[PDB]
Design a protein around this nucleic acid. Structure first.
Ligand code: MG
Ligand code: ZN
Ligand code: ZN
Ligand code: ZN
Ligand code: ZN
Ligand code: ZN
Lengths: 109, 74, 198, 46, 301, 96, 144, 48, 97
RNA sequence: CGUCAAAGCACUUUGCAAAAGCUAACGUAUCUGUUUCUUGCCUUUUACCAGAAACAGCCGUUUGUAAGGUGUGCUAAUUUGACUGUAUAGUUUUUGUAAUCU
């Protein structure tokens, strides 16, 4: 809560001391909680969600090393096509006990 | 502002973006036996969510991690 | 190559962001919906599986199940308020229930047309007087109707019987033509221009 | 004094109605060199 | 160094992100609006309280503009509409319809002429009473910001392409473009004299262009770094000082950037919790206005 | 008709009217009609030249009236709205 | 819902499709009585599966094969033989194969997000391709 | 006779319906009555 | 005839079949174009005479013109409080972490 | 019915706010509780008896407004509001007793 708006060039803000050497790596960091520094941030939901999904995808790709994919518009349909091909057919409703019994979203693989 | 729980990054997952819930007064500290809020998060996909086990008064007197009960220095 | 693909992708990303921020039906990026009704078999199965709560499979729900005792009298009032009237064999009620199966509030108010209600009950008056005159041997129901240690009645075999018939005057075909088709309904004129709506 | 006493009074009075207050809060979080290792990247948590 | 009671005044209100906040040309009022579909009118001097709320808009106030008369308010809505709000009485004067998507920016004229762009890849000129677009310009890609010269023949439109196009309303000859940007242009602003054009782009570079019929090529005067854009693709504004010697911009790193228009950064003052959407300067004194997506706006020096 | 209503309002007062001849009439209006036929009393006729004559009872046909000078205090008379079917401006309480 | 022998006879096309609706009710009773082998929420999935199947049968009768008149279809929706809101969702783009209405509502989730079955599988990792906890759905996405 | 006092509309069931713990459906009245009787019996038994 | 309504309470000069001109404030008109003028002055031939409240015949009227324009927000929820800017130690976009 | 204007409209879910101003049914219906008094029955408390005053609670109602849902539309449907709303060359105004000069 600095109260005086001030030009930039004097923002280096030095501590101006002999740099106490007794401190160890735990206290070199400024923190509120014991573990670290935490502060509020007004992130809209969509950006957080999309970049979080991106990070999770990267983690899975690193773990499984299966990262050989691209991204596009018709590419989206093309990737859906192979997975849909591996899926078995959804049955027809009004057929209930086997031999084409309807299973829609519950169709297995 | 009762902002955040002290949790080590070993059990906070290797993802830089996590989602976690808090329910005030939902538990008693396992040392203080004082009311305390739980924080539940997912360390990684394919794992049961973790949760804090002690209040913030503890893990301050003990310099420890509220979830995995390990000291934050050693 | 180059410019057309780069600009199409850039516009795609920009317009996706715009859809997220200012979607047609989105509040904060998610599509708004309404809390819908579950099939009645859901609650039927919940109540059958819970049973007498004598299983460890549900021992996590006992605290809430017992905490609903505070709201039980409200459920009693809402249930008694919607008792079926003599002229109707059965009444379907919009109900509100805990997912635990702990409590079950009949979420309705018995809203009626006042002249219609008075007419129906006057009809009941005449029919009951006629039957008490004509029966010549009236066997009153015994109380309590069910024996003390009897298990509670299973709904499974209550839904298979024909619901018998109720007290209904034989309305004349031409004298009572205006009120023939809806006199003994529950919500009489819901779909006609005589009532604003449901 | 009015503000302080009013705050205490409101807290006391609050102790049957169902509470309805749900809204996400985002926290930008900075790890601090716990067990040596290599610190960690900055994190934001919902 | 002004008539403000306190040098810094944090302003609370709104229930969602605030997207725009512009000073009255007289310098005594200013209005703000955002995702809560409400516009609030403020008092620059005095108690700094609300005297009016502009209710009725059925969408987010993407942008709004003050009138020279300082009595009517034009608002840009995400619901594909442009409403004219009578500031003194707070009643809906007219609702200009005709776009086919979210209308991103808005600008007014020195004469009763309105201009706007929307995601339907079009720009429309509106008379204050005709209730219909007098002129329509159709582009390939969605447009994001406009600025009209107060002389009254040139409009600058900026969109996905990354090249500012200068359109002459009467001539319909468009063969002059201010190239130089390489990403989406969030905002444009014209100088008080109408001689220079200020642009912000999502390639993180704020550039300044000259609006003159003749140029010595490389119309690019100078470029500015530091003001950066986040991943939310927000439309961050740029501002012109009253004396037109300081240029300002907002950034998604919660910092307000003020320059001297000569290439040296002057103010980098922080203070916001989220992305800083809009920024403006008072026309009389040395105040600065901040507008951020953290439900708050700040008054300046 | 609001003008005819004001003329009826005038009844009982002293109104001056001049006819297509140019002569002005100073007397008390006692009757009026929708056609603006007028009845007057104690009239002082000022001819076009300026000669002053006097009449007692007249029935001026309305088609030959140029204008009338109504007494000033009638400027506050109420102008009621007239619906389609109504032929007289009166306070209304029904639909319109 | 339930109909007596003295009730107003249903429209003409009812008797051809009565037996299959009775069979739907039969399996609903069987699912109600069958107990065990699941968590507190897992045992309640076949209910939603069968409800979706029955409503989809009626929707198929009307909108794709035109085997029933509109009067009978409106009657069926009125007598709760089919879910009106679920059919309304099926009739609009993006929700052609919606499993149930609990996997679309965002107020029933922890983080205000729709269910996992709604995400297209091309954008989903191989590990997190599981059965939905609400109803056992295995992918509602219209693409899949 | 007291002239009714002004107050904003509040109702327990709407507040309960807002939560995720309560769902809604349409059942026969007798089934609902049997359910209420059974639930009250179970609550009293658990309290005993 | 909606334009005829717009001249009420205005000041009008009416040139007449006789050749005179009346100037005054319009109070009410008629389907036969009977005009009611308040505080009316007579322009003979120009000599000024105060006339007062005047009802014109429809036939008498030739043309008319106007000489003068017709005679003649609740609250908000925001609240201001002084505050200072708090410098954060981070330099990163809100989206990026 | 007609003209003009703006609002998609009908049904419906939820949130927020308000509901006597000029003596008058928010509810043509009707319960409970607390405090302070006066009573009844009374061995002491709860539970009680029945009248008053001052307060509260619960079951409901109406309106405004905000965001949604369903069914139908925007290649029109409906609603709300406003309106100095109608014919007519044959004497009482608008299909000319005018021009001529003075
Ligand atoms: Mg004792
Ligand atoms: Zn830990
Ligand atoms: Zn503790
Ligand atoms: Zn589902
Ligand atoms: Zn699901
Ligand atoms: Zn699903």
């Amino acid at each position: 809560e600095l109260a005086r708006n001030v030009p930039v060039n004097e923002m280096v803000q030095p501590a101006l001391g002999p740099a106490n050497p007794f401190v160890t790596k735990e206290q070199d960091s400024i923190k509120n909680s014991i573990t670290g520094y935490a502060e509020r941030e007004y992130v809209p939901n969509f950006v957080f969600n999309q970049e979080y999904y991106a990070n999770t995808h990267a983690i899975y790709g690193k773990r499984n090393f299966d990262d050989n994919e691209a991204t596009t518009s018709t590419d989206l349909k093309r990737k859906s096509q192979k997975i849909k091909e591996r899926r078995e057919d959804p049955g027809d409703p009004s057929i209930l006990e086997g031999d084409g019994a309807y299973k829609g979203p519950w169709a297995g693989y | 502002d009762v902002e955040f729980p002290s949790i080590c990054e070993r059990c906070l997952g290797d993802n830089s973006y996590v989602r976690m819930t808090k329910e005030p007064l939902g538990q008693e500290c396992k040392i203080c036996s004082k009311p305390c809020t739980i924080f539940r998060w997912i360390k990684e996909r394919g794992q049961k969510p973790g949760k804090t086990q002690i209040c913030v008064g503890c893990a301050r007197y003990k310099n420890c991690c509220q979830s995995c009960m390990l000291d934050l220095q050693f | 190559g180059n410019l057309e693909k780069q600009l199409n992708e850039r516009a795609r990303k920009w317009r996706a962001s715009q859809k997220s921020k200012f979607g047609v039906k989105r509040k904060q990026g998610y599509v708004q919906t309404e809390k819908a009704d579950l099939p009645p078999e859901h609650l039927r199965k919940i109540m059958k599986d819970r049973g007498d709560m004598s299983s460890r499979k549900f021992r996590a729900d006992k605290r809430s199940y017992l905490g609903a005792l505070k709201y039980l009298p409200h459920a009693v009032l809402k249930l008694l308020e919607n008792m079926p009237m003599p002229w109707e064999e059965y009444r379907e009620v919009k109900v509100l229930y805990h997912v635990t199966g702990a409590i079950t509030f009949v979420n309705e108010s018995p809203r009626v047309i006042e002249p219609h209600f008075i007419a129906q009950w006057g009809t009941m008056w005449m029919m009951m007087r006629r039957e008490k005159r004509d029966r010549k041997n009236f066997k009153r129901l015994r109380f309590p109707p069910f024996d003390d240690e009897e298990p509670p009645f299973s709904i499974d075999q209550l839904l298979d019987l024909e619901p018998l018939e109720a007290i209904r005057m034989d309305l004349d075909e031409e004298d009572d033509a205006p009120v023939m088709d809806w006199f003994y309904e529950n919500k009489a004129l819901e779909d006609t221009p005589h009532v604003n709506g449901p | 004094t009015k503000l302080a006493l009013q705050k205490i009074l409101s807290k006391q009075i609050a102790q049957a109605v169902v509470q309805q207050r749900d809204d996400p809060v985002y926290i930008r979080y900075t790890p601090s060199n716990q067990m040596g290792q290599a610190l960690s990247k900055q994190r934001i948590i919902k | 160094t002004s008539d403000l009671n306190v040098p810094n005044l944090q302003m609370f209100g709104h229930t969602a992100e605030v997207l725009v906040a512009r000073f009255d040309p007289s310098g005594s009022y200013f209005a703000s609006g955002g995702m809560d579909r409400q516009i609030l009118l403020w008092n620059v001097f005095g108690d700094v309280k609300n005297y009016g709320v502009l209710n009725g808009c059925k969408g987010a106030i993407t942008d709004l503009q003050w009138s020279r008369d300082s009595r009517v308010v034009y608002c840009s809505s995400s619901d594909t509409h442009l409403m004219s709000w009578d500031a003194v009485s707070g009643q809906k004067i007219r609702k200009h319809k005709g776009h086919a998507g979210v209308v991103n920016a808005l600008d007014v004229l020195k004469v009763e002429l309105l201009t706007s762009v929307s995601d339907d890849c079009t720009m429309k000129v509106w008379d204050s009473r005709s209730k219909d677009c007098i002129k329509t310009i159709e582009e390939k890609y969605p447009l994001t910001a406009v600025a009209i010269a107060q002389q009254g023949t040139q409009v600058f439109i900026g969109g996905i392409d990354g090249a500012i196009k200068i359109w002459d309303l009467r001539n319909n000859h468009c063969s002059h473009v201010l190239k130089g940007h390489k990403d989406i242009i969030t905002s444009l602003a014209i100088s008080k004299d109408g001689s220079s054009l200020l642009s912000n782009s999502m390639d993180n570079t704020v550039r300044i262009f000259d609006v003159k019929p003749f140029a010595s090529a490389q119309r690019q005067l100078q470029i500015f770094e530091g003001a950066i854009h986040g991943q939310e693709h927000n439309l961050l504004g740029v501002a012109w000082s009253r004396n037109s010697r300081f240029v300002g911009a907002g950034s998604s790193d919660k910092n307000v950037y003020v320059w001297s228009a000569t290439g040296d950064l002057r103010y980098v003052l922080p203070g916001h919790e989220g992305s800083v959407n809009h920024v403006d300067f008072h026309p009389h004194q040395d105040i600065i206005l901040s507008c951020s997506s953290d439900r708050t706006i700040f008054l300046g020096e | 008709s609001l003008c005819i209503k004001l003329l009826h309002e005038t009844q009982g007062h002293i109104v001056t009217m001049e006819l297509e001849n140019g002569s002005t009439y100073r007397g008390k209006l006692i009757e009026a009609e929708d056609n603006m036929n007028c009845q007057m009393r104690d009239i002082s006729v000022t001819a076009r030249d300026g000669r002053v004559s006097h009449l007692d009872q007249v029935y001026i046909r309305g088609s030959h009236i140029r204008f009338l000078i109504v007494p000033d205090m009638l400027r506050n008379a109420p102008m009621f709205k007239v619906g389609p079917g109504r032929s007289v401006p009166l306070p209304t309480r029904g639909r319109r | 819902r339930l109909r007596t022998s003295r009730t107003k006879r249903p429209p003409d096309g009812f008797d051809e499709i009565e037996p299959t609706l009775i069979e739907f009710q039969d399996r609903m009773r069987q699912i109600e009585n069958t107990m065990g082998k699941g968590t507190k929420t897992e045992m309640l999935a076949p209910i939603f599966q069968l409800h979706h199947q029955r409503s989809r049968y009626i929707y198929d009768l009307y909108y794709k094969r035109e085997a029933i008149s509109t009067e009978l279809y409106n009657w069926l929706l009125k007598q709760n033989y089919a879910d009106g809101n679920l059919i309304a969702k099926w009739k609009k783009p993006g929700y052609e194969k919606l499993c149930c209405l609990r996997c679309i509502q965002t107020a029933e989730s922890k983080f205000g997000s729709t269910c996992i079955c709604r995400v297209p599988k091309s954008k989903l990792d191989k590990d997190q391709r599981v059965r939905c906890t609400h109803c056992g759905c295995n992918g509602c996405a219209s693409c899949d | 006779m007291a002239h009714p006092k002004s107050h904003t509309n509040r109702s327990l069931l709407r507040q309960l319906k807002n939560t995720k713990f309560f769902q809604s459906t349409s059942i026969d009245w007798v089934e609902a009555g049997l359910q209420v009787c059974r639930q009250g019996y179970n609550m009293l038994q658990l309290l005993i | 005839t909606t334009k005829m309504v717009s001249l009420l309470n205005h000041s009008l000069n009416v040139t007449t079949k006789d050749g005179r001109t009346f100037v005054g404030q319009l109070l009410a008109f008629d389907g036969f174009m009977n005009l009611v003028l308040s505080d009316c002055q007579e322009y003979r031939h120009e000599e000024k005479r105060m006339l007062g409240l005047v009802i014109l015949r429809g036939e008498f009227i030739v043309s008319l013109s106007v000489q003068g324009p017709p005679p003649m927000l609740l609250s908000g929820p925001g609240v201001a409080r002084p505050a200072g800017r708090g410098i954060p130690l981070g330099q990163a976009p809100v989206g990026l972490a």
